[PDB]
Amino acid sequence: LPPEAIKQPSPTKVELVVGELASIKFDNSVLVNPANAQLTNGGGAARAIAKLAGPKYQEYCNSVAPISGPLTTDSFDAKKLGVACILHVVPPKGSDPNVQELLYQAYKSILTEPAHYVIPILGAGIFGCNPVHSLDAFRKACPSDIGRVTLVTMNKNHLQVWDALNRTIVRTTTDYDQVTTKALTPQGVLEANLFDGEDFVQEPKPGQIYLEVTEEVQNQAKELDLNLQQYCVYLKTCHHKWVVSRTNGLMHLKQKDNNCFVSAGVNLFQNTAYQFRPAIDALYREYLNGNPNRFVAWIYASTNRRVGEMGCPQQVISLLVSNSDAAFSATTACCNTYFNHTGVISVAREYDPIQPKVYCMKCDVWTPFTPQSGKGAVAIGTSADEPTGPAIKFAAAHCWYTNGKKTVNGYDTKANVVATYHRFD
Ligand SMILES: [Zn+2]
């Protein structure tokens, strides 16, 4: 309570200092004395304080004789050093229940006013307490606004016990290949950019694996055109085992786990003349050689599906084509307007599996067209008519590639066609 010891609230910054009490950099400090009820100052920190405060200090302690609760005392001789006063508390002797509660109510007993505290860690001695409990009791009791605080050790292993108690164990990956377990400070946790699969996480649950979103992660996602939710899905789907198989001139993705929407899209694509942009052609040349894993996982993450779930083959072929060099120019049949078109044609009305069309804004009709450049075009829509070239048919929640002439990788019933490829010749 001495008025010269008061400092107005400030965010607490604890410091754990090495050597003995005489060493400390004081500042009108409250020096804590871990004592017995008779203030004999027998040994430990308590005798080191007693032979610092002087003999008149020790006589006044004998006057007041047995102490039941904490006692505040002037600092006597130690005032020269910057000690405003001395606070006496009786640690529990670490051999009784419950010692860590009494440890906690000992530090609570100490840290009550906004002052600079210097504290020998409680429970030293062979009659003492586990120092990890003491350091833990202290963080449980330390208020958040009580500025600079100094603990005092002389054990040189306690700087680790301290560092560990203020770190949380986090499992992280950039990969879903190698997983790394880290001990992070509440600062390191936010520097880690821990990602849940949905959102960033500033208190990780134990045992759970988090994506550490480095800048290499961000660049990889963007090379693949995925946000981070998608990128996580992508990394995990790379672990699915698939079988691919040369059949009908193309590498086919064996039916499994509702993946037909993928095989149908990739098989149409294989019967066009398009070339993927560099990042994606790298996945694709793996698939074409027997490593379907990355390319297929990219398909699922780009179209927001999970393996086992069944998706849209138009989604797939449109994803593939837009990541390629697909483009053509032409003139309309309705008014001979020149135009350019990249990606698939989405023929929303008047879809004709043997006559591809575009929408003319001028005449407000779905018109055929005469190509001036490019190699072909993919059209998507739905009609019951039959195609005469590479197409995709969808019926009864199954979908499959068919070249124009029966030539099928699935059934040969009546089915809507949902995508067709039209070469220009
Ligand atoms: Zn027109």
Numbering used by the authors: 1 to 425
Question: What does the original paper state about this entry?
Answer:
Here, we first report the structure of PDCoV Macro-Ubl2-PLpro from δ-CoV with 2.5 Å resolution. The Macro-Ubl2-PLpro monomer consists of three distinct domains: Macro, Ubl2, and PLpro. At the flanking N-terminus of the crystal structure, Macro adopts a conserved three-layered α-β-α sandwich fold, similar to the macroH2A variant of human histone 2A. Amino acids (aa 166-215) fold into a ubiquitin-like 2 domain, which lies in front of PLpro and is well separated from PLpro and Macro. At the tip of the finger domain, four cysteines (Cys334, Cys335, Cys360 and Cys363) from two β-hairpins that coordinate a zinc ion with a tetrahedral structure. The short BL2 in PDCoV PLpro causes the space for substrate binding to be much larger than the corresponding spaces of USP14 and other CoV PLPs. We determined that the active sites of PDCoV PLpro consist of Cys and His residues, similar to the active sites observed in many PLPs. Cys260 is located at the base of α9 of the thumb 3.6 Å from His398, which is situated at the base of the palm domain, while the third hypothetically conserved site aspartic acid (Asp412) is not well aligned with Cys260 and His298, the position of PDCoV PLpro Asp412 is quite inconsistent among other PLPs, and the possible explanation is that the Asp412 is located on the flexible loop connecting β19 and β20 (Figure 3(A) and Figure 6(A–C)). In the asymmetric unit, two of the subunits form the head-to-tail homodimer, with a total area of 807.3 Å2 buried in the interface. The SAXS profile calculated based on the monomer crystal structure is consistent with that in solution, while the profile calculated based on the dimer crystal structure is inconsistent, indicating that the protein is monomer in solution.
Nonstructural protein 3 (nsp3), an essential component of the replication/transcription complex, is one of the most important antiviral targets. Affinity for adenosine diphosphate ribose (ADPr) or poly-ADP-ribose is a well-known characteristic of Macro, and in some cases, it also shows ADP-ribose 1″-monophosphatase (ADRP) activity; however, the biological significance of this enzyme activity remains unclear. PLpro is responsible for the hydrolytic release of nsp1/2 -nsp4; in addition to hydrolytic activity, PLpro also possesses deubiquitinating and deISGylating activities.
